[PDB]
Amino acid sequence: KLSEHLRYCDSILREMLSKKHAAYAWPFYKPVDAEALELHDYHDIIKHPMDLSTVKRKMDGREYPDAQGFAADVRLMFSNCYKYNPPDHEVVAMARKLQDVFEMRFAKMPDE
Amino acid sequence: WYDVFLTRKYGKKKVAC
Ligand SMILES: [N]
Numbered sequence: 001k002l003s004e005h006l007r008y009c010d011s012i013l014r015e016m017l018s019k020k021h022a023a024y025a026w027p028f029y030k031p032v033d034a035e036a037l038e039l040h041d042y043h044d045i046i047k048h049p050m051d052l053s054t055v056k057r058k059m060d061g062r063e064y065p066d067a068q069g070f071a072a073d074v075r076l077m078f079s080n081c082y083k084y085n086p087p088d089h090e091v092v093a094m095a096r097k098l099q100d101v102f103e104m105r106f107a108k109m110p111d112e
Numbered sequence: 113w114y115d116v117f118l119t120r121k122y123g124k125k126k127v128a129c
Contacts, residue, residue: 026113026129027125036116037114037116037119037120037125038119038120038123039119039123039124039125040123085124085125086124089124089125090127091125091127
């Protein structure tokens with residue numbers, strides 16, 4: 001049982017996971033596997049990892065009290081990407097493209 | 113997805129797809 005406003009957030013999450021954004025959303029479909037990739041400083045630099053699979057599990061588990069809590073996790077996910085990766089990296093460009101989608105949708109949903 | 117070999121090699125994310 002999600003509130004009307006969190007239902008709009010769930011719709012945004014579904015859009016971010018949809019096929020049309022797959023070319024730039026895929027880095028965010030699961031946590032960064034720093035051990036498998038041997039990025040040995042990832043967790044020293046990124047104190048609070050976040051990704052869309054975790055956001056979805058929290059949404060489905062009714063863990064977000066309001067839209068701002070959902071948006072905080074989405075923005076944390078993007079901020080981690082900007083913090084960890086080189087500024088000209090392909091994955092930073094993908095983050096910006098997906099964040100543009102998110103910020104437009106989040107801005108435009110009904111109020112309250 | 114990431115190229116595991118090259119990501120480990122260079123210490124930064126390397127895109128395979
Ligand atoms: N790719």
